[PDB]
Amino acid sequence: MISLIAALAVDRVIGMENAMPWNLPADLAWFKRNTLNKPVIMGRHTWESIGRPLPGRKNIILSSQPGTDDRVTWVKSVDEAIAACGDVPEIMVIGGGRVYEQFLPKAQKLYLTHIDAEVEGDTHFPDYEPDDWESVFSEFHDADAQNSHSYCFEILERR
């Protein structure tokens, strides 16, 4: 199955974690727990923002202008990215906006962090028509000494 994982700010703005004025180690932990031992697919801007492969995962970069870096797998198409994951139970798509857009129609599950921060981002998370998805897990957290803003985790599964 294909799953997307994203952090959505107020108005569903998404962007690069390093450009955001939040510090959310709890969200980093959630991302790590849900992606470890799985392949992750990202676009070129996300790769360039992270600057290095995410350890403990197979990194696959979907772009039209491929890369210099032998630690990751470069692919040119959605079907190539999927094949690059091979025989696995769950493929994690970790963004870019354009990447989320390309994979959402194929996705069965969404892992979202809803952040109580109004921020400038690259774009918004794609329309996920409420009625195609059911919320199966949901948990709210306040801001604390380690996490600058309050956040809610949610998992949705496709109807």
Added chain:
Amino acid sequence: QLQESGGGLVQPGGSLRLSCAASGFTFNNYWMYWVRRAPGKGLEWVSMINPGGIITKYAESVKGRFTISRDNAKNTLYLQMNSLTSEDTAVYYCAKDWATGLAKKGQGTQVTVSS
């Protein structure tokens, strides 16, 4: 209450430290931010620091060059700026609750970096 100071005219390559005196809230309980407004532009966050002053995060444009710090006993926030460049010219503000509807910042301090 937040009041920034320490702004001025600095030659490129120079250093400057800004200060923000805080009152009227429990300073040591809050994340604090530095943000800036460059001529013609929106506000751009620059730096943030957690209550105890042990977690910091910097915008990519200032990493390796700026240091945010705080003195919870004095209720003051600091921004050390090194290797200043023309592109750092801006009104700098200290802010509480940045990126929320509770966001508040001072009147700001002007930094002009000019050769």
